[PDB]
Amino acid sequence: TTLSTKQKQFLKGLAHHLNPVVMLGGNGLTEGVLAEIENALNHHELIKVKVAGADRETKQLIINAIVRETKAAQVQTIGHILVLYRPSEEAKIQLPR
């Protein structure tokens, strides 16, 4: 998913009003966590995934794997939160041109 600068910023602003819908723990990106992320992308398009207690390299492994498997766009990485977006066949969120 390739987002323009303006699209990414639009989604970053919207995600400020969202809570995380997936949380990772010590076991990282398990099969079940990936299914939760897929589910969340499907229903919500724009999601926040909490990745607490991850150092920079660990978090990067996780980000890379999520993007590879899901084809979601990275909207924002700040601290322990990953904001991701993937469009739906039935758009829920109006994305700017």
UniProtKB/Swiss-Prot annotation:
UniProt keyword S-adenosyl-L-methionine, yes or no: no
Keywords assigned: RNA-binding
Record flagged with keyword RNA-binding: yes
Disulfide feature: none
Gene3D superfamilies: YhbY-like (3.30.110.60)
Domain called CRM: residue spans: 1-97
GO MF term list: RNA binding
Source organism superkingdom: Bacteria
Record PANTHER family: RNA-BINDING PROTEIN YHBY
Descriptive protein name: RNA-binding protein HI_1333
Protein's organism: Haemophilus influenzae (strain ATCC 51907 / DSM 11121 / KW20 / Rd)
